[PDB]
Amino acid sequence: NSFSGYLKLTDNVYIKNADIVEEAKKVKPTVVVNAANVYLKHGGGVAGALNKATNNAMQVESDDYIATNGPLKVGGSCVLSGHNLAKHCLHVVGPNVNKGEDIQLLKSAYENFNQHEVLLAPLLSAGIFGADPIHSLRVCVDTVRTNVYLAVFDKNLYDKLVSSFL
């Protein structure tokens, strides 16, 4: 869990302009967080980048879990293997705002982080799921009590998040 180069936003939330995959390779964290959907079908954002970095081992494990146990709930999570990226991957489902799921469920989604002392994580629902990134960051800061290291890959977005936090 060696995090370096992060900006301190609050006493327990830190942020860095980086690819979450590269950070996981360099930090070797106990938990990396994936922004998932309820079927753990890993798509065009963080999820597909994590899965590719595991040479599809994440998708095979995910398909098996879902076939055996059923889909997650929006706002829910499950802990699976971190493969070569981390010890554990916490798959969390934020609301899909573009499809009319309730943005209030973003608070439930972030509450999952509180079961883990330290996490490398992305901003939930702020990419393919269409939530406002600044709002996602505020919900994270207000909800999460454990230590969270956020990795934001796009520089223009990182800059806009940091400044709105002045």
Ligand X SMILES: Nc1ncnc2c1ncn2[C@@H]1O[C@H](COP(=O)(O)OP(=O)(O)OC[C@H]2O[C@@H](O)[C@H](O)[C@@H]2O)[C@@H](O)[C@H]1O
With binding defined as CB under 6 A, does residue 123 bind ligand X?
A: yes
Q: Based on the shown chain and the rule CB under 6 A, indicate whether residue 20 belongs to the binding site for ligand X.
A: yes
Residue written as tokens 């972030």? 110
Among 95, 94, 36, smallest CA distance to 65 is for 36
Residue 103: C-alpha distances to residues 20, 78, 142 (Å):
24, 20, 15
Q: Which of 13, 15, 21, 140 binds ligand X (CB under 6 A)?
A: 21
With a CB cutoff of 8 Å and minimum separation 6, the contacts of 75 are 93, 94, 95, 105, 106, 108, 109
Residue 100, interface with ligand X (CB under 6 A)?
no
Q: Where are the beta strands (DSSP E) in 67-161?
A: 77-81, 88-93, 118-121, 147-152
Nearer to ligand X, 72 or 116 (CB): 72
Amino acid present at 75: G
49 binds ligand X per the rule CB under 6 A: yes
76 binds ligand X per the rule CB under 6 A = no
Closest contact distance (angstroms) between CB of 32 and ligand X is 11
43 contributes a contact to ligand X by CB under 6 A: yes
What are the φ and ψ backbone dihedral angles of 79, each rounded to 5 degrees? -105, 120
**Segment contacting ligand X by CB under 6 A, of 8-16, 60-68, 81-89, 118-126:** 118-126
125 binds ligand X (CB under 6 A): yes
Residues that bind ligand X (CB under 6 A): 19-21, 35-37, 42-49, 94, 122-129, 133, 151-154
